[PDB]
Structure 1
Amino acid sequence: GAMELDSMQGQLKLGCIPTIAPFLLCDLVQEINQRFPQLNLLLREDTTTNLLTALRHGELDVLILALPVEIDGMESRVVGQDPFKMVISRHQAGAIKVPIKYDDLPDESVFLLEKEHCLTEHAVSACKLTDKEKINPFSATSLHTLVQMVANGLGTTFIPQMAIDHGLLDNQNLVVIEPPGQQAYRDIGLVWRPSSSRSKTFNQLAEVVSELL
């Protein structure tokens, strides 16, 4: 018979936005499988506002977000920075000169995600895109289909470095360019409820995530 028998044990419900989740969480899972093998991560992917509601309502324990976004009343910790690049099709790379000058781009040549995705506000502000006439009026609804439109030669867009590092551009014959701006990156952060009893778990997770960025 046998005798019947800690922060990083057990189950955690973690939410993450669509422009992060496919990239960073692959690396996070591989690290915690080894370093914290009793931690089971139930994962939810949703856009920022929906994730915040789920966190406040106790449907999720912790979020991995891009910051800043509205997180009144929550506790957060910034864990690293994720650079922005621009991308254009190799077959349009000639007809667009580098360094990129937005005034030199055609009108309606910049494609962006619908505004429920925080990537659009982060990129437009961090890369100083102030001329709204360069933005195409057709809004993209996923990072993958945004990139596919650029690969079809339709214009250009801003892409986070973690997507590039995880192969998002593979086999799509794209060129990666630096945007304008001295602070062309987004912060990445973990967000949780102040009344949680699991802050030690979240801060240990925070340290793991920071090492992936």
Structure 2
Amino acid sequence: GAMELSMQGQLKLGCIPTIAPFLLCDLVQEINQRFPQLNLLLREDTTTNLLTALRHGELDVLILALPVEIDGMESRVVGQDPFKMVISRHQAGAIKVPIKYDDLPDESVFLLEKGHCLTEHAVSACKLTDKEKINPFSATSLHTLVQMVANGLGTTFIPQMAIDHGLLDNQNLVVIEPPGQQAYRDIGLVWRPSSSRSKTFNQLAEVVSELL
């Protein structure tokens, strides 16, 4: 017979669509090795829906792009994800580098529809202020946005973690620096102040920081 005898157990983690396909692959491989008893149940949803789930205790922690509206939550920025622009190789000549927005054709910049935070982050970080350059047809996923660019229709902003995870492979695209600073978005973990699992979230924040 036999005697009866923070990074263990189950965690419910939410993440936005322009982060989840990319960073979470790396996170799972790391925690498999470093925290083998941590089971990560995963939710992908919009920033607004993730925040509602977090408030309602349906998720333990979020990985978000910041800044977004998170009043009352606790957050920790863990790294920076640069922005690039992309154009098709076949349109590379019709668009001059360095990019100057005023020299682009009207309606040549495609963007995700409002409610994708990639759009608010990229437009502000990359200082696109001339709305006449934005195509009126809004994209509804990062993959189909990039495919329209690959079809030669214009240009857009993409996060570095997508490039590093092969999103552009076999689509004959060229990667270009956007105007302004070296522009980027913050990545952060977000959780409830009343949670009893802050020790877990801070350990997870350290792991995520090393992936950026």
1:6-49 deviations in whole A, cap 9, x for unaligned?
x0000000000000000000000000000000000000000100
1:68-97 deviations in whole A, cap 9, x for unaligned?
000000000000000000000000000000
1:110-163 deviations in whole A, cap 9, x for unaligned?
000011110000000000000000000110000000000000000000000000
User: Match of 1:211?
Assistant: 210
Q: Structure 2 length as normaliser, TM-score? A: 0.99
User: Match of 2:104?
Assistant: 105
User: Match of 2:172?
Assistant: 173
Could you tell me how far 1:2 is from its partner in structure 2? 2.4
Separation in 2 of the partners of 1:172 and 1:49? 32
Separation in 2 of the partners of 1:45 and 1:122? 19
- In the alignment of these two chains, the number of paired residues is 212
Separation in 2 of the partners of 1:13 and 1:172? 34
Separation in 1 of the partners of 2:138 and 2:4? 57
Separation in 2 of the partners of 1:82 and 1:157? 16
Could you tell me how far 1:181 is from its partner in structure 2? 1.1
User: Match of 1:83?
Assistant: 82
Could you tell me how far 1:4 is from its partner in structure 2? 2.5
SS in 2 for 1:144: helix
Could you tell me how far 1:183 is from its partner in structure 2? 4.4
Q: Structure 1 length as normaliser, TM-score? A: 0.99
Q: Percent identity?
A: 100
User: Match of 2:54?
Assistant: 55
Separation in 1 of the partners of 2:40 and 2:3? 28
Separation in 2 of the partners of 1:69 and 1:112? 18
Separation in 1 of the partners of 2:207 and 2:156? 30
SS in 1 for 2:33: helix
Structure 2 segments unaligned to the other structure (5+ residues)? none
